[PDB]
Amino acid sequence: STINFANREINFKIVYYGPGLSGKTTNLKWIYSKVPEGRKGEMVSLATEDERTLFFDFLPLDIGEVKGFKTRFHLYTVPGQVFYNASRKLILRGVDGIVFVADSAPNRLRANAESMRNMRENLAEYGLTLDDVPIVIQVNKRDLPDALPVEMVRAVVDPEGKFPVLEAVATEGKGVFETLKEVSRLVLARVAG
Ligand SMILES: Nc1nc2c(ncn2[C@@H]2O[C@H](COP(=O)(O)OP(=O)(O)O)[C@@H](O)[C@H]2O)c(=O)[nH]1
């Protein structure tokens, strides 16, 4: 919700959250790869020895123009294994909607729950609960030979079925644009009404 009058843009921030290696970078890289050259900034990767953050912004093709303003989305993630919480907490500053990218691997079930607990904790620092921000779950890695049942994955990350759920194979693009359409429509929904 930072309004830029000078480029006449309204800006929305979408954070991909989830356990290390769940396919967040993959989501963002797939999306980036399909946005036309003149409608995207650079992909920015920031990294210290132990901390990381990846982000880019783009002008969605399918979004109108409330009284002369164009819509720019800013996609942010903390990719890789995490050793410190600070990047995760900071990534959430000014978030408008969240895609929780859950891993289908049975040896990642606990890390899914853990990552959802951490998201909740971090949102709580900004004074938000899980109801206060649109969240969509992507159960990624459906192509794993041991992939858990979606409903099992959802149960550890969304016990109450409060959030939409989509399946993905981010490496193949499958579920990637459906996921972003879903979160984007919930974001624009909440501003609108
Ligand atoms: N089998 C499978 N592998 C995936 C999928 N999405 C990503 N990966 C792989 O999982 C690893 C972790 O993905 P990455 O996007 O970097 O994880 P992040 O740390 O959440 O960004 C990479 O080797 C990806 O190529 C998927 O749908 N299926």
DSSP state string for 131-158 = TSS-EEEEEE-TTSTT---HHHHHHHH-
Is residue 179 within 8 A of residue 166, CB to CB? The reply is yes
Exposure string (b/e) for 108-133, b if CB count within 10 Å is 16 or more?
Answer: bbebbbebbebbeebbeeeeeebeeb
Structure tokens at 22: 């769940």
Q: Which domains does the chain have, with CATH numbers?
A: 1-193 (3.40.50.300)
Residue nearest (by alpha carbon) to ligand 1 atom 18: 21
Q: 79: part of which helix (H) or strand (E)?
A: none
Experimental method of this PDB entry: X-ray
Tell me the resolution in Å. 1.9
Is 181 assigned a ligand-binding role in the annotation? no
Q: From the alpha carbon of 77, which atom of ligand 1 is closest?
A: 21
117 is known to lie in a ligand binding site: no
3-state helix, strand, coil in the chain (%, to 5): 35, 25, 40
Q: Which atom of ligand 1 is nearest to the CA of 168?
A: 27
Distances in Å between the Cα of 2 and the Cα atoms of 23, 105, 128, 152 are 28, 38, 19, 38
DSSP category for residue 69: P
Ligand 1 center from residue 19 Cα (angstroms) = 11
- CB distance 10 to 74 below 8 Å: no
* Structure-block tokens of residue 140: 């990624």
Q: In this structure, are residues 86 and 48 in contact, taking their beta carbons and an 8 Å threshold?
A: no
Determine how β-strand 3-4 pairs with β-strand 9-17: antiparallel
